[PDB]
Tab-separated table of C-alpha atoms (C1' of nucleotides) in Angstrom:
chain	number	residue	atom	x	y	z
A	8	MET	CA	99.863	110.728	95.991
A	9	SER	CA	99.660	107.099	97.131
A	10	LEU	CA	96.038	105.985	97.329
A	11	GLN	CA	95.327	103.048	99.630
A	12	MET	CA	92.147	101.133	100.383
A	13	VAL	CA	91.105	100.916	104.040
A	14	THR	CA	89.428	98.289	106.200
A	15	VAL	CA	86.746	99.279	108.680
A	16	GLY	CA	85.492	97.914	111.982
A	17	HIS	CA	82.033	96.976	113.191
A	18	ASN	CA	80.463	100.441	113.451
A	19	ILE	CA	81.081	101.136	109.778
A	20	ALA	CA	77.557	102.534	109.424
A	21	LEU	CA	78.363	105.595	111.540
A	22	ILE	CA	80.091	107.128	108.507
A	23	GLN	CA	77.943	109.149	106.112
A	24	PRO	CA	78.540	111.834	103.478
A	25	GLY	CA	79.086	115.161	105.169
A	26	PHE	CA	80.963	114.062	108.266
A	27	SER	CA	83.816	115.952	109.920
A	28	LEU	CA	87.362	114.975	110.897
A	29	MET	CA	88.773	117.271	113.523
A	30	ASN	CA	92.443	117.120	114.504
A	31	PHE	CA	93.951	117.696	117.950
A	32	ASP	CA	97.748	117.506	118.456
A	33	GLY	CA	98.377	114.822	115.863
A	34	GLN	CA	95.300	112.665	116.476
A	35	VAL	CA	92.052	112.637	114.529
A	36	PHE	CA	88.445	112.619	115.718
A	37	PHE	CA	85.366	111.695	113.713
A	38	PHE	CA	82.238	113.778	114.229
A	39	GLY	CA	78.767	113.920	112.763
A	40	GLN	CA	77.666	110.297	112.784
A	41	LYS	CA	74.522	108.886	111.181
A	42	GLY	CA	71.494	109.180	113.433
A	43	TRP	CA	71.204	110.517	116.988
A	44	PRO	CA	73.914	109.473	119.472
A	45	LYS	CA	73.455	105.774	120.170
A	46	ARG	CA	73.971	104.513	123.709
A	47	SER	CA	77.364	102.933	123.009
A	48	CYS	CA	78.807	106.429	122.499
A	49	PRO	CA	76.601	109.295	123.714
A	50	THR	CA	78.569	112.034	121.928
A	51	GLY	CA	79.233	110.763	118.408
A	52	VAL	CA	82.792	112.096	118.763
A	53	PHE	CA	85.237	109.294	117.997
A	54	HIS	CA	88.908	108.461	117.934
A	55	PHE	CA	89.296	107.953	114.179
A	56	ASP	CA	92.600	106.103	114.465
A	57	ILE	CA	93.868	104.219	111.410
A	58	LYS	CA	96.665	101.694	111.909
A	59	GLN	CA	97.798	99.142	109.319
A	60	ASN	CA	95.000	100.483	107.093
A	61	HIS	CA	92.420	99.454	109.686
A	62	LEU	CA	90.396	102.128	111.466
A	63	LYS	CA	88.877	101.885	114.939
A	64	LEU	CA	86.034	104.308	115.609
A	65	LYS	CA	86.422	104.550	119.310
A	66	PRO	CA	84.206	106.505	121.722
A	67	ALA	CA	85.276	109.638	123.554
A	68	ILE	CA	83.637	111.306	126.526
A	69	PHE	CA	83.239	115.031	127.019
A	70	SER	CA	84.138	117.043	130.098
A	71	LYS	CA	81.925	117.706	133.101
A	72	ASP	CA	80.887	121.127	131.757
A	73	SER	CA	80.573	120.553	128.009
A	74	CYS	CA	77.435	120.690	125.859
A	75	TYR	CA	76.385	117.528	124.039
A	76	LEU	CA	75.949	118.688	120.514
A	77	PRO	CA	73.796	117.046	117.852
A	78	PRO	CA	75.620	115.366	114.975
A	79	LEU	CA	75.700	117.925	112.170
A	80	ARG	CA	75.962	116.804	108.552
A	81	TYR	CA	77.450	119.767	106.718
A	82	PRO	CA	78.956	122.148	109.269
A	83	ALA	CA	81.610	124.795	108.770
A	84	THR	CA	84.715	123.894	110.759
A	85	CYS	CA	87.801	126.052	111.236
A	86	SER	CA	90.932	125.275	113.244
A	87	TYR	CA	91.120	128.208	115.660
A	88	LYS	CA	94.719	127.753	116.788
A	89	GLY	CA	94.567	130.662	119.214
A	90	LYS	CA	94.790	126.909	123.395
A	91	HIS	CA	94.111	124.969	120.193
A	92	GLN	CA	90.403	124.519	119.471
A	93	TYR	CA	87.931	124.071	116.618
A	94	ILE	CA	84.842	126.056	115.671
A	95	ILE	CA	81.599	124.423	114.508
A	96	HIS	CA	78.907	126.458	112.752
A	97	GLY	CA	75.683	125.401	111.070
A	98	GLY	CA	74.625	122.054	109.677
A	99	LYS	CA	71.786	119.608	109.222
A	100	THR	CA	70.677	118.075	112.527
A	101	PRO	CA	69.601	114.421	112.079
A	102	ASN	CA	66.036	115.751	111.962
A	103	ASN	CA	66.870	117.648	108.749
A	104	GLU	CA	66.907	121.137	110.219
A	105	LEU	CA	69.507	123.860	110.274
A	106	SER	CA	71.432	124.967	113.343
A	107	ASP	CA	72.608	128.489	114.079
A	108	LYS	CA	74.655	127.424	117.103
A	109	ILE	CA	78.430	127.785	117.312
A	110	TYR	CA	80.413	125.168	119.218
A	111	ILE	CA	84.044	125.206	120.336
A	112	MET	CA	85.790	121.836	120.599
A	113	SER	CA	88.696	121.943	123.030
A	114	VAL	CA	90.610	119.214	124.876
A	115	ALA	CA	90.344	119.649	128.639
A	116	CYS	CA	92.010	116.385	129.710
A	117	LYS	CA	94.164	113.767	127.963
A	118	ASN	CA	95.808	110.942	129.911
A	119	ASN	CA	96.671	107.402	128.807
A	120	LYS	CA	95.577	108.601	125.349
A	121	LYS	CA	92.056	108.959	126.793
A	122	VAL	CA	90.968	112.363	125.512
A	123	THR	CA	88.311	114.328	127.372
A	124	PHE	CA	86.883	116.991	125.096
A	125	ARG	CA	85.078	120.164	126.095
A	126	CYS	CA	82.375	121.223	123.645
A	127	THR	CA	81.290	124.553	125.032
A	128	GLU	CA	78.868	126.589	122.951
A	129	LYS	CA	78.752	130.289	122.194
A	130	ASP	CA	75.788	132.178	120.773
A	131	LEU	CA	75.907	135.274	118.589
A	132	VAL	CA	74.375	138.741	118.653
A	133	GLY	CA	74.164	141.596	116.192
A	134	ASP	CA	74.128	140.599	112.540
A	135	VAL	CA	73.746	136.882	113.306
A	136	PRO	CA	73.985	134.757	110.149
A	137	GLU	CA	70.989	132.794	108.965
A	138	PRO	CA	71.195	129.066	109.775
A	139	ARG	CA	72.812	127.485	106.753
A	140	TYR	CA	75.118	124.727	105.599
A	141	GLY	CA	77.728	124.022	102.983
A	142	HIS	CA	79.391	127.335	103.802
A	143	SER	CA	82.928	127.960	105.059
A	144	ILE	CA	84.160	129.825	108.140
A	145	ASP	CA	87.824	130.703	108.610
A	146	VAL	CA	89.897	132.635	111.115
A	147	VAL	CA	92.035	135.617	110.120
A	148	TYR	CA	94.718	137.543	112.003
A	149	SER	CA	95.584	141.241	111.826
A	150	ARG	CA	97.364	143.716	114.135
A	151	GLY	CA	97.593	140.855	116.630
A	152	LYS	CA	93.810	140.745	116.897
A	153	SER	CA	91.795	138.067	115.132
A	154	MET	CA	88.364	137.563	113.616
A	155	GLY	CA	86.254	134.879	111.969
A	156	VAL	CA	85.102	135.398	108.390
A	157	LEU	CA	81.998	133.590	107.172
A	158	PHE	CA	80.840	133.506	103.552
A	159	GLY	CA	77.500	131.791	103.458
A	160	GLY	CA	76.257	128.815	101.522
A	161	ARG	CA	72.793	127.454	100.821
A	162	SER	CA	69.883	127.350	103.280
A	163	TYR	CA	66.137	126.782	103.499
A	164	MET	CA	63.544	129.231	102.281
A	165	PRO	CA	62.752	131.923	104.865
A	166	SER	CA	59.887	131.402	107.254
A	167	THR	CA	57.377	133.177	104.993
A	168	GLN	CA	57.994	132.087	101.396
A	169	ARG	CA	58.274	128.474	102.579
A	170	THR	CA	55.466	126.131	101.537
A	171	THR	CA	54.947	122.445	102.206
A	172	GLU	CA	54.697	121.463	98.544
A	173	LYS	CA	58.356	122.590	98.437
A	174	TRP	CA	59.222	122.261	102.106
A	175	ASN	CA	62.728	120.901	101.514
A	176	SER	CA	63.805	123.100	98.602
A	177	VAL	CA	66.951	125.110	99.235
A	178	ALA	CA	68.341	128.438	98.083
A	179	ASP	CA	71.799	129.981	98.271
A	180	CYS	CA	72.101	132.674	100.894
A	181	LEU	CA	72.917	136.274	100.120
A	182	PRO	CA	76.613	136.711	99.338
A	183	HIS	CA	77.267	138.805	102.417
A	184	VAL	CA	80.414	138.392	104.495
A	185	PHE	CA	80.234	138.010	108.266
A	186	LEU	CA	82.911	138.938	110.774
A	187	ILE	CA	82.642	137.188	114.131
A	188	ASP	CA	84.407	138.116	117.365
A	189	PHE	CA	84.756	134.872	119.298
A	190	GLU	CA	85.628	136.763	122.486
A	191	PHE	CA	82.227	138.431	122.787
A	192	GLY	CA	80.692	136.336	120.015
A	193	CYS	CA	79.621	139.416	118.053
A	194	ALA	CA	78.670	139.227	114.375
A	195	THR	CA	78.878	141.913	111.703
A	196	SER	CA	77.473	141.539	108.201
A	197	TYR	CA	79.055	143.290	105.228
A	198	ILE	CA	77.803	143.687	101.666
A	199	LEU	CA	80.488	143.258	99.017
A	200	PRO	CA	79.513	144.394	95.501
A	201	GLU	CA	82.182	142.419	93.643
A	202	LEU	CA	80.500	139.263	94.995
A	203	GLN	CA	77.048	138.932	93.435
A	204	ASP	CA	75.734	135.367	93.282
A	205	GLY	CA	75.327	132.836	96.055
A	206	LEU	CA	77.928	130.164	96.565
A	207	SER	CA	77.851	126.843	98.410
A	208	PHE	CA	80.277	123.961	98.847
A	209	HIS	CA	83.179	126.218	97.930
A	210	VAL	CA	86.757	125.897	99.163
A	211	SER	CA	88.119	128.569	101.468
A	212	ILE	CA	91.760	129.213	102.319
A	213	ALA	CA	93.013	131.366	105.196
A	214	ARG	CA	96.456	132.980	104.961
A	215	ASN	CA	97.065	135.111	108.051
A	216	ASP	CA	95.255	138.164	106.727
A	217	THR	CA	93.290	136.987	103.671
A	218	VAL	CA	90.759	134.403	102.568
A	219	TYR	CA	90.864	132.812	99.117
A	220	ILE	CA	87.408	131.552	98.170
A	221	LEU	CA	87.509	129.330	95.123
A	222	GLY	CA	85.134	126.934	93.465
A	223	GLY	CA	81.654	126.343	94.749
A	224	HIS	CA	78.330	125.416	93.229
A	225	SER	CA	75.905	128.284	92.606
A	226	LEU	CA	72.307	127.150	93.015
A	227	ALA	CA	70.877	130.478	91.828
A	228	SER	CA	71.832	129.561	88.256
A	229	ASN	CA	73.214	126.001	88.575
A	230	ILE	CA	76.798	126.707	87.492
A	231	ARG	CA	80.244	126.363	89.072
A	232	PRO	CA	81.860	129.809	88.702
A	233	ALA	CA	85.578	129.276	88.110
A	234	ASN	CA	86.516	132.686	89.534
A	235	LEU	CA	88.290	132.945	92.877
A	236	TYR	CA	87.963	135.830	95.295
A	237	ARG	CA	90.551	137.257	97.662
A	238	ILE	CA	89.063	138.853	100.759
A	239	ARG	CA	91.399	141.184	102.638
A	240	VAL	CA	90.406	141.992	106.217
A	241	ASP	CA	91.902	144.872	108.187
A	242	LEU	CA	91.511	145.286	111.952
A	243	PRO	CA	91.810	148.923	113.049
A	244	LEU	CA	91.310	149.980	116.659
A	245	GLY	CA	87.705	150.979	115.934
A	246	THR	CA	85.664	149.218	113.265
A	247	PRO	CA	87.218	146.549	111.011
A	248	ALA	CA	87.082	146.638	107.231
A	249	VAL	CA	86.790	144.162	104.367
A	250	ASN	CA	87.707	144.255	100.682
A	251	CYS	CA	87.296	141.731	97.880
A	252	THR	CA	89.052	141.193	94.558
A	253	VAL	CA	88.446	138.737	91.752
A	254	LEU	CA	91.576	136.945	90.616
A	255	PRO	CA	92.422	134.831	87.562
A	256	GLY	CA	93.499	131.215	87.532
A	257	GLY	CA	90.435	129.974	89.391
A	258	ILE	CA	88.868	126.542	89.080
A	259	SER	CA	85.258	125.490	88.521
A	260	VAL	CA	84.731	122.966	91.309
A	261	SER	CA	82.463	122.182	94.236
A	262	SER	CA	82.572	119.765	97.163
A	263	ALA	CA	86.353	119.672	96.932
A	264	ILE	CA	88.573	118.536	99.798
A	265	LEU	CA	91.434	120.755	100.955
A	266	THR	CA	94.498	120.099	103.050
A	267	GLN	CA	97.882	121.625	103.840
A	268	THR	CA	100.734	119.397	102.700
A	269	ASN	CA	103.708	121.666	103.386
A	270	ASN	CA	103.655	125.089	104.962
A	271	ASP	CA	101.513	127.509	102.889
A	272	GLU	CA	101.123	124.831	100.212
A	273	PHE	CA	97.731	123.166	99.891
A	274	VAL	CA	96.291	120.350	97.836
A	275	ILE	CA	92.717	120.206	96.551
A	276	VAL	CA	91.365	116.766	95.695
A	277	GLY	CA	88.287	115.790	93.701
A	278	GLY	CA	85.061	117.741	93.573
A	279	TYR	CA	82.772	118.128	90.560
A	280	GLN	CA	82.982	120.013	87.273
A	281	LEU	CA	79.394	119.278	86.205
A	282	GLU	CA	76.299	117.659	87.644
A	283	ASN	CA	77.845	114.410	86.393
A	284	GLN	CA	81.544	115.282	86.016
A	285	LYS	CA	83.385	113.275	88.630
A	286	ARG	CA	86.502	115.389	89.162
A	287	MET	CA	89.884	113.675	88.909
A	288	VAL	CA	92.655	116.263	88.539
A	289	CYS	CA	94.066	117.533	91.818
A	290	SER	CA	95.203	121.113	92.302
A	291	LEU	CA	98.183	122.509	94.202
A	292	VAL	CA	97.549	125.905	95.773
A	293	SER	CA	101.112	127.165	96.217
A	294	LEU	CA	100.558	130.172	98.441
A	295	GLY	CA	102.835	133.182	98.536
A	296	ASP	CA	103.209	136.533	100.226
A	297	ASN	CA	100.356	138.162	98.308
A	298	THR	CA	99.846	135.973	95.203
A	299	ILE	CA	98.163	132.595	94.751
A	300	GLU	CA	99.929	130.064	92.530
A	301	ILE	CA	97.443	127.531	91.237
A	302	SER	CA	98.856	124.404	89.597
A	303	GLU	CA	98.231	120.664	89.433
A	304	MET	CA	99.933	117.366	90.213
A	305	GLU	CA	99.928	114.069	88.323
A	306	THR	CA	96.224	113.194	88.886
A	307	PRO	CA	96.737	110.594	91.666
A	308	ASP	CA	96.194	106.992	90.560
A	309	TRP	CA	92.465	106.241	90.738
A	310	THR	CA	91.283	102.645	90.861
A	311	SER	CA	88.509	101.209	88.709
A	312	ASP	CA	85.816	101.495	91.382
A	313	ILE	CA	86.537	105.208	91.765
A	314	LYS	CA	86.142	105.747	88.020
A	315	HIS	CA	82.983	103.636	87.694
A	316	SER	CA	81.182	105.373	90.564
A	317	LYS	CA	79.343	108.689	90.577
A	318	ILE	CA	79.893	110.464	93.919
A	319	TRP	CA	82.127	110.498	96.967
A	320	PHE	CA	82.827	112.385	100.169
A	321	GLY	CA	85.532	112.780	102.762
A	322	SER	CA	87.816	115.208	104.516
A	323	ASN	CA	91.407	115.824	105.619
A	324	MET	CA	92.808	113.790	108.498
A	325	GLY	CA	95.160	116.709	109.124
A	326	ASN	CA	98.686	115.810	107.994
A	327	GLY	CA	98.519	115.980	104.200
A	328	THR	CA	96.266	112.929	104.327
A	329	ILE	CA	92.835	112.790	102.734
A	330	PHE	CA	90.108	110.290	103.620
A	331	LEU	CA	87.553	109.460	100.923
A	332	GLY	CA	84.520	107.241	100.764
A	333	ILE	CA	82.450	105.825	97.940
A	334	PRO	CA	79.054	104.070	97.835
A	335	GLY	CA	78.735	100.323	97.619
A	336	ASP	CA	77.727	98.328	94.560
A	337	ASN	CA	74.001	97.927	93.935
A	338	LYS	CA	74.405	95.228	91.267
A	339	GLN	CA	77.048	93.496	93.433
A	340	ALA	CA	74.684	93.801	96.385
A	341	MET	CA	77.065	91.770	98.590
A	342	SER	CA	78.735	95.093	99.408
A	343	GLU	CA	79.124	96.782	102.786
A	344	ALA	CA	77.183	99.900	101.771
A	345	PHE	CA	80.408	101.944	101.477
A	346	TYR	CA	84.031	101.473	100.487
A	347	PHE	CA	86.711	103.762	101.863
A	348	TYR	CA	90.181	105.027	101.052
A	349	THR	CA	92.967	107.076	102.537
A	350	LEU	CA	95.464	108.758	100.235
A	351	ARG	CA	98.606	110.518	101.412
A	352	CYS	CA	99.527	113.803	99.769
A	353	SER	CA	102.927	113.328	101.463
B	30	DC	C1'	-3.282	142.816	102.518
B	31	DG	C1'	-7.305	139.379	101.293
B	32	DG	C1'	-9.746	137.868	96.962
B	33	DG	C1'	-9.339	135.527	92.533
B	34	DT	C1'	-6.775	132.364	88.048
B	35	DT	C1'	-3.550	128.727	87.035
B	36	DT	C1'	-2.037	123.974	88.116
B	37	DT	C1'	-3.398	120.041	90.031
B	38	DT	C1'	-6.332	116.931	92.029
B	39	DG	C1'	-10.970	114.107	93.831
B	40	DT	C1'	-14.470	111.878	90.819
B	41	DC	C1'	-18.054	109.534	88.314
B	42	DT	C1'	-19.927	103.580	88.026
B	43	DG	C1'	-18.508	99.950	84.001
B	44	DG	C1'	-16.246	96.988	82.145
B	45	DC	C1'	-11.050	95.629	81.444
B	46	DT	C1'	-7.012	94.173	82.367
B	47	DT	C1'	-2.675	91.677	84.249
B	48	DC	C1'	-1.428	89.348	87.455
B	49	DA	C1'	-0.618	88.222	92.562
B	50	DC	C1'	-2.402	84.402	94.868
B	51	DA	C1'	-4.603	81.060	97.402
B	52	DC	C1'	-2.328	75.167	98.706
B	53	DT	C1'	-0.003	71.217	98.457
B	54	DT	C1'	5.166	68.588	97.845
B	55	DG	C1'	9.171	67.215	96.122
B	56	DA	C1'	12.943	68.646	92.770
B	57	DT	C1'	15.829	71.976	91.803
B	58	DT	C1'	18.884	76.172	92.802
B	59	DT	C1'	21.332	79.626	95.894
B	60	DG	C1'	23.732	81.159	100.395
B	61	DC	C1'	26.803	80.691	103.576
B	62	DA	C1'	29.455	78.206	106.229
B	63	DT	C1'	33.304	75.054	106.715
B	64	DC	C1'	37.990	72.521	105.270
B	65	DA	C1'	42.775	71.104	104.243
B	66	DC	C1'	46.709	73.507	102.905
B	67	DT	C1'	50.354	76.827	102.347
B	68	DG	C1'	55.447	80.861	105.259
B	69	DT	C1'	59.791	76.813	107.061
B	70	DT	C1'	64.540	84.116	111.709
B	71	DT	C1'	65.842	86.954	113.858
B	72	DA	C1'	68.354	92.254	112.768
B	73	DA	C1'	69.852	96.196	115.273
B	74	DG	C1'	70.815	97.684	120.019
B	75	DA	C1'	71.568	97.816	125.548
B	76	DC	C1'	73.743	95.880	129.444
B	77	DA	C1'	76.740	92.678	131.858
B	78	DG	C1'	80.424	90.073	133.275
B	79	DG	C1'	84.814	87.870	132.266
B	80	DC	C1'	89.360	87.413	130.400
B	81	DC	C1'	93.324	89.498	129.191
B	82	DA	C1'	96.583	93.061	128.651
B	83	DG	C1'	98.755	96.960	129.484
B	84	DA	C1'	99.425	100.616	132.868
B	85	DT	C1'	100.893	102.303	137.536
B	86	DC	C1'	102.500	102.614	142.419
DNA sequence: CGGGTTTTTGTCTGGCTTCACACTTGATTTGCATCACTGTTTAAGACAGGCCAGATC
């Protein structure tokens, strides 16, 4: 838990709350810049390489058959390691509008450390999920087969109850659960009675047949339910099946950042306990065979600027390494609009 | 429906009235133009060479 400040190059501005840090074979790629793709880099996808605590947002071209995707600000990203590739669902297009598209980042050519991505897209049929953001998609395995579970987060009002005096107001989606076949791209919605209230900005965890949902703001009543939910997914030869169970030991948190330090051993770094409760304590999710072992570490050393601020953002660079940001200083206006940090969970 | 009872007008010739109004000419006011003066750069973003540095045959 060694926090370290970071220096930043000339295109510092391209970082904004809600970005994404994908990870291909030990190297990290920034995605979801601020504003439509500028001409310097037409894809927004960057080499996010940090060396000597200095990061170089470098461009990266796509393949000759990819699909140039708009920079989304709160997508749902899972690491489909089954050819290694990532899945992108939902988000806020720079024009403040929700996307229902699913994208699949792969790497089709890498030579001289010049990566050539391949951002093909796949559309859905059947019980397609409403365009939304803040949710969490995760892949699950069973009987060799695999599926993608999706537990929705907030969204815009539907196209009928939506009025211009409240055109931007949001509402949590219905706590359904979606199963998605990436092969055919087929969706299947499931009602689960043990899940009642909407949930956004939660923290999902996939363990090879189950999904642990924990934390998450609840806009329907403006509380952070501290109850976590194990979803168990079975894949028969006909129709799949889902089950949910509440479990104790949960945490009331939202907008938390997850990563996998050791095998089946995760860390969860700051989110929020209240509308104004900057979270400090970190949480170790020591997985098991069927049980979740929540615990905490020694509240990694936070500097003064992190205590005297109000919000942050960030993600997981991939190898037990979290990247945080923090807004500048408005009274110390000679600030570069954002300060950044990387901290190693080791 | 067209004929008849209200409001509303024409209407009297006298004497009354206030006041606009003829007709200069300079001394004022009032309207509407001029006038002299002020601020004392860039900040993002596209494209192009060019130099260097590291890769490759």
